[PDB]
Amino acid sequence: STGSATTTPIDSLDDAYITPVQIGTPAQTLNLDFDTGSSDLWVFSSETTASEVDGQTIYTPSKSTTAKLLSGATWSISYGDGSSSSGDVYTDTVSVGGLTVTGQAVESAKKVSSSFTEDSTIDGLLGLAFSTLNTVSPTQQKTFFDNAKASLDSPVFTADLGYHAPGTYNFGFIDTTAYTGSITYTAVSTKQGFWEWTSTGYAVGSGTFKSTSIDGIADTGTTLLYLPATVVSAYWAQVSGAKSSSSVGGYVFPCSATLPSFTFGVGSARIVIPGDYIDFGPISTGSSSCFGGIQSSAGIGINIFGDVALKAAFVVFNGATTPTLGFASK
């Protein structure tokens, strides 16, 4: 089997992407944030504290003939940005882009933190990291990808995120028309439960390539590119007037600037992030200070190849017995 679904930016900055997901019988379609940095499929629901729901579409298990309470199971998750959610668990039928899993753990939110409430466009998350990070207790549950894997034509999914435009998540096949040149594959460590890999270096603009190992995670659920302070300083030093602002919470730059590209290495191959992808606009409405898309990972504890980086590539998440990651230009 295979599946193919379009993923759409939630706003003009590509702050996140939402993908429609069918849950239950008859289908209830919710727009979920596919997140390769976590492993829970959780939704706003009829059980969510009413004061914490503001415009989201909810899953109502009582209206699904295939929903079953997973008795005694609870979940609770905290994300790298300080947001969180928790609740109980149902199993139900879940379909993405024509690919159907029966018995999928659908984690129903009883509580969500303010950032989730305030984002009317995201109805929940669909985790695509390794199932070892799933938070369901006392019986850990599998991700949608892990459940689908054995049925898939090939045990892979691909992320093809757009810049200010829709893109595609495919399950079970590699669309050879969706990228240019060849896909370069690189080793993955699953030791922390992430799609963790080592970039071979970077370049700023038309500068020379610096060969250096950068361990990090491919994370579709993180907006920006978080890299070591040395790398990030070298990038922003090429933008007149750019500076790190503790009050704003990262590097800002004059909105009048033209940003240089940023290149990252995948083995001997190179992925080029155009300068425009690094512009996240005014720090507040009407400001001439703009927020940078490349930020320091210092104090996160891990480097994160988030959407800024991934949207410059066609990315293969290969879930074979020994997982790997592939990157192609597009």
UniProtKB/Swiss-Prot annotation:
**Record keywords, A-Z:** Aspartyl protease, Disulfide bond, Hydrolase, Protease, Signal, Zymogen
User: What family is reported?
Assistant: Belongs to the peptidase A1 family.
Catalytic residues as annotated in Swiss-Prot or TrEMBL:
D35, S199
The scientific name of the source species is Cryphonectria parasitica
Q: Which example biological process does GO assign this protein?
A: proteolysis
Domain Peptidase A1 per the UniProt entry, residue ranges: 17-328
> Which section of the whole protein is represented?
90 to 419 of 419
| Protein's name in the database | Endothiapepsin
> What reactions does this protein catalyze?
Hydrolysis of proteins with specificity similar to that of pepsin A, prefers hydrophobic residues at P1 and P1', but does not cleave 14-Ala-|-Leu-15 in the B chain of insulin or Z-Glu-Tyr. Clots milk
Enzyme Commission numbers on file = 3.4.23.22
Disulfide bond as a keyword?
yes
Disulfide bond entries: C255-C290
Query: Under which main EC class is this enzyme filed?
Result: hydrolase
Question: Which Gene Ontology molecular-function terms are recorded?
Answer: aspartic-type endopeptidase activity
